[PDB]
Design an enzyme around this catalytic site. Structure first.
Site, PDB file in Angstrom:
ATOM      1  CG  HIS A   1      76.784  14.898 105.505  1.00 14.55           C
ATOM      2  ND1 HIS A   1      77.967  15.351 104.960  1.00 14.55           N
ATOM      3  CD2 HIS A   1      76.243  15.957 106.150  1.00 14.55           C
ATOM      4  CE1 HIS A   1      78.150  16.619 105.295  1.00 14.55           C
ATOM      5  NE2 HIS A   1      77.115  17.009 106.012  1.00 14.55           N
TER       6      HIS A   1
ATOM      7  N   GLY B   1      82.373  22.514 102.170  1.00 11.79           N
ATOM      8  CA  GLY B   1      83.591  22.183 102.868  1.00 11.79           C
ATOM      9  C   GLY B   1      83.615  22.667 104.309  1.00 11.79           C
TER      10      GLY B   1
ATOM     11  CB  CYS C   1      80.035  19.839 106.668  1.00 15.04           C
ATOM     12  SG  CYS C   1      78.836  20.433 105.427  1.00 15.04           S
TER      13      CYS C   1
HETATM   14  C1  R30 Z   1      80.922  13.308  98.543  1.00 14.78           C
HETATM   15  C2  R30 Z   1      81.137  14.794  98.277  1.00 14.78           C
HETATM   16  C3  R30 Z   1      80.062  15.816  98.793  1.00 14.78           C
HETATM   17  O1  R30 Z   1      80.041  16.913  98.201  1.00 14.78           O
HETATM   18  N1  R30 Z   1      79.133  15.618  99.841  1.00 14.78           N
HETATM   19  C4  R30 Z   1      78.110  16.558 100.305  1.00 14.78           C
HETATM   20  C5  R30 Z   1      77.773  16.717 101.655  1.00 14.78           C
HETATM   21  C6  R30 Z   1      76.764  17.629 102.113  1.00 14.78           C
HETATM   22  C7  R30 Z   1      76.018  18.449 101.248  1.00 14.78           C
HETATM   23  N2  R30 Z   1      74.962  19.399 101.662  1.00 14.78           N
HETATM   24  C8  R30 Z   1      73.518  18.904 101.538  1.00 14.78           C
HETATM   25  C9  R30 Z   1      73.342  17.644 102.338  1.00 14.78           C
HETATM   26  C10 R30 Z   1      73.027  17.504 103.697  1.00 14.78           C
HETATM   27  C11 R30 Z   1      73.041  16.240 104.159  1.00 14.78           C
HETATM   28  S1  R30 Z   1      73.489  15.173 102.927  1.00 14.78           S
HETATM   29  C12 R30 Z   1      73.650  16.451 101.828  1.00 14.78           C
HETATM   30  C13 R30 Z   1      75.233  20.627 102.244  1.00 14.78           C
HETATM   31  O2  R30 Z   1      74.275  21.374 102.590  1.00 14.78           O
HETATM   32  C14 R30 Z   1      76.630  21.210 102.500  1.00 14.78           C
HETATM   33  N3  R30 Z   1      76.793  22.605 102.807  1.00 14.78           N
HETATM   34  N4  R30 Z   1      76.848  23.077 104.115  1.00 14.78           N
HETATM   35  N5  R30 Z   1      76.966  24.339 104.148  1.00 14.78           N
HETATM   36  C15 R30 Z   1      77.022  24.830 102.795  1.00 14.78           C
HETATM   37  C16 R30 Z   1      77.155  26.095 102.240  1.00 14.78           C
HETATM   38  C17 R30 Z   1      77.176  26.249 100.846  1.00 14.78           C
HETATM   39  C18 R30 Z   1      77.064  25.117  99.994  1.00 14.78           C
HETATM   40  C19 R30 Z   1      76.933  23.849 100.560  1.00 14.78           C
HETATM   41  C20 R30 Z   1      76.910  23.706 101.966  1.00 14.78           C
HETATM   42  C21 R30 Z   1      76.362  18.271  99.896  1.00 14.78           C
HETATM   43  C22 R30 Z   1      77.354  17.373  99.423  1.00 14.78           C
END
Ligand code: R30
Ligand code: R30
Lengths: 302, 304
Positions: free
Chosen positions: A41, A146, A148
């Site tokens: 992603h 951030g 991930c």
């Molecule tokens: C282009 C900028 C950007 O922000 N991208 C992005 C990527 C991933 C997420 N997601 C959801 C998801 C999953 C697949 S596609 C989207 C999370 O769960 C990220 N995440 N991971 N651990 C977390 C802990 C707290 C908040 C968010 C968190 C959200 C946004």
């Protein structure tokens, strides 16, 4: 003596973390030899996160779409020379082999198993903690946006078993990721949509481990002569939010050293589930299920 | 989101661990440039553990009485070329400077403060965990015989604050050690003789930190308009095994982010410590006090 949540030393893995950027998106990756793994992603623009066409996205990428930076312990400039997708992961190839790659394997962990997580932000390691893979294929971590691409691992001797790459938050304090075969634990989708989780359960074999620990630390008040068979416990467990108990050689060693049989503890569990009658066990008034038998053998007996 | 027990990445410190040997005795040491630190009870024969004369033991030794070896990274032996005692610690001078010496300082932690521990055996790192200096100057760790000389630390920027070197088990799951000026926490003695502990207490300001973490994680049922001033809380604490609460800017930031006053949480603690009446807070049925204000700000807000 004493029993606490313990993680593997993280040095080996720290030297493997990098940052990966693709357009307006950045996160962590793992640099092993000539490969750099990260969540796919990272390709996805913010306006398509709820419905990514990952096939299309991969097609639009060239090796120039990816920026890989090493932010600690090396003046490493990393050129992407190849890119591929494997399940929920990207596999980027870089023109330099990580000189600090550890001996390693890729393994998929099962529920009740523990592993260490190295929490990372912009390719900088910030903290480490241990988690158990819950029966519902989630973990209970501490992750912010951030994080991930943060990795989870075990360690047998000099060999690092990589088993987790952080992908998403599903709910407060509830996370999941994929194994390095690219498969997501729990088959959760890497889309930004709400996804129901199955019910969590007590990891029976770990509660036994924890009670053995208690006994070895001089706390053995819950032990009675009475016994419940593995078979009868496993029927009771089905009705009472416990996993099926499967014995291992690790558990058997605790039984040998204490002289208390597994079936005495399965009985104890059925009594303690009802409540502790105002008593405690290793400082707790509730059943603990995130100490595995291996972890207890390590901490109590070396 | 989520709050878990978290330790510092350990790689910096891993590269400083060694094994120190004095005859038949062996434990862990900390190699910083030219100096190797370790507990002075490495010198003491089983014979003498209950009533060690450490001054007499020291003079009986020469540089050849000790050796040091590096197991992690590139293995080596480090020849000892000087020896000294500072409080409950030895400083051994060796003939090679650790080429992976971090920037560091030596600090002394106060009760309620948290640090990371790198547990080691025979100079090899085996695990890491985080502890709090208890109000009675013990920590609640996980240590086996052989673990002596394991270190505790925190980190600010690049600078490692070495604040603990492990010395002894006082009772089950109960441990202490020294700061690097050689003084033992709690003024416990490095002798195999029973020593009574002062009373352990709930660390109030940490309990307050953890309730804020709960609120920030969607768990706020214990929040009510009822308040209890600090002074009135502190008079109550003296009588109910809680530490004196002292606010800090770290706490204040949490107050602001949550719009819930310290005073409301101080009231809550007075109700909660007798029990949660069947409810749970961050998966726990009891007060948790090993999460510091700084730790909660870092894990939840992202601020350090
Ligand atoms: C282009 C900028 C950007 O922000 N991208 C992005 C990527 C991933 C997420 N997601 C959801 C998801 C999953 C697949 S596609 C989207 C999370 O769960 C990220 N995440 N991971 N651990 C977390 C802990 C707290 C908040 C968010 C968190 C959200 C946004
Ligand atoms: C090979 C000879 C030998 O055994 N020496 C030795 C040194 C220190 C200790 N003590 C007590 C003490 C202190 C000063 S003099 C004696 C500990 O508390 C060691 N220790 N530290 N953490 C432990 C955890 C479990 C058991 C023992 C532990 C015990 C033995």
């Amino acid at each position: 003596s004493g029993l606490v949540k313990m993680s593997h030393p993280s040095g080996d893995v720290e030297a493997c973390m990098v940052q990966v950027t693709c357009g307006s998106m950045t996160l962590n990756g793992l640099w092993l030899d000539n490969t750099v793994w990260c969540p796919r992603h990272v390709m996805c623009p913010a306006d398509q996160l709820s419905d990514p066409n990952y096939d299309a996205l991969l097609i639009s990428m060239t090796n120039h779409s990816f920026s890989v930076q090493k932010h600690i312990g090396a003046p490493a400039n990393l050129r992407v020379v190849g890119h591929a997708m494997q399940g929920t992961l990207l596999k980027l190839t870089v023109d330099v082999a990580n000189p600090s790659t550890p001996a390693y394997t890729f393994t998929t962990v099962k529920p009740g198993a523990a592993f260490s997580v190295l929490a990372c932000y912009n390719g900088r390691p910030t903290g480490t903690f241990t988690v158990v893979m819950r029966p519902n294929y989630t973990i209970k971590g501490s992750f912010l946006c951030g994080s991930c691409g943060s990795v989870g691992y075990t360690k047998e001797g000099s060999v690092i078993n990589f088993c987790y790459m952080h992908q998403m938050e599903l709910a407060n304090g509830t996370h999941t990721g994929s194994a390095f075969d690219g498969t997501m634990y729990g088959a959760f989708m890497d889309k930004q949509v709400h996804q129901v989780q199955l019910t969590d359960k007590y990891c029976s074999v770990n509660v036994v481990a924890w009670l053995y620990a208690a006994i070895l630390n001089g706390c053995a008040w819950f032990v009675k002569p009475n016994r419940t068979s593995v078979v009868s416990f496993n029927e009771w467990a089905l009705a009472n939010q416990f996993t099926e108990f499967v014995g291992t050689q690790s558990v058997d060693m605790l039984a040998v050293k204490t002289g208390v049989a597994i079936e005495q503890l399965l009985y104890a569990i059925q009594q303690l589930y009802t409540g502790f009658q105002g008593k405690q066990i290793l400082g707790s008034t509730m059943l603990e299920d995130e100490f595995t038998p291996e972890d207890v053998n390590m901490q109590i007996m070396g």
